Amino acid sequence: SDIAFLIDGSGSIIPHDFRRMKEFVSTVMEQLKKSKTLFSLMQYSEEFRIHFTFKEFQNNPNPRSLVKPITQLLGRTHTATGIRKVVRELFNITNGARKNAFKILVVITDGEKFGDPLGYEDVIPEADREGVIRYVIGVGDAFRSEKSRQELNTIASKPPRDHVFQVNNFEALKTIQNQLREKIFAIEG
């Protein structure tokens, strides 16, 4: 499986919480490790950081060492342009993406889209055609309404039930850690 992450780095995430998010990531890529997996990382705000590629991952397969030096971007929440990039750059053959492989994307964000030139309507479709599986994690009191959560469903594969996870704070991501790990295995064996 070609597995890629998209981490929210906007300015509303505090330095200690930005730090817990990074540990979650490192821990999970370990649990999901298998002799044929590849991981990829990208954080977004208004800027867009490609930390490691699938082909670079297989150059230094160290979840933890690779995740360690990552510093926060601090901008605004442009989630669609991010999704755009995951799809057009990371699942690109030149960046080591494998042809007969699965494509799973885990999206973690502590907020609603804002001041993004693109709409989810401009990106999802490209996402489905390329056959990408999206899981969504909505952290904080942002996705607190029968409304903002309505963003999570829009981002995520269907049925919405199985692809969305929302947790009250960054320190609680540990709770959904286990149930995620598994959904991701039923796609292969």
Added chain:
Amino acid sequence: SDIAFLIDGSGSIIPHDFRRMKEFVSTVMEQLKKSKTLFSLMQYSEEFRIHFTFKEFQNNPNPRSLVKPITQLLGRTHTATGIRKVVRELFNITNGARKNAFKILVVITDGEKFGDPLGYEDVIPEADREGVIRYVIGVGDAFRSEKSRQELNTIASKPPRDHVFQVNNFEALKTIQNQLREKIFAIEG
């Protein structure tokens, strides 16, 4: 007619050349002002400006007035975003835009679209939908290739040779007033 102008305030355009452009815009409005005709102007860069809407123009239908106060923006070139913005906003109902009227857009540019999230694919489609006619003026050296010309052939309506004007510099826009003007009359009487 719902006639609207998309002008390029790229800091690639020297003030006077930007003055001439501004000058050019006023004359065509005056030369084309029928009775039931309405006008709107926006200046686009990395930033975008709603200089005035149809709704306004009919309660001060004076080209020399409105055009006069415009201030250049200098950022980079986001054409596509600009396009999407015309169709989505200028051409909206609360903006003077009348439903039973012809929609006509005149774009003026200095170079190729640089650092823009959206593509023409992102926006061309939705432009045909509500049926906006597009006529593009391209200025100078920037568009003297077989590849730049392409970008011009793209923002136009079909056929492209009757929707495209590839002028040589700001002075030289005075050369196409008749044409641009006569093309826009023929489709109303």
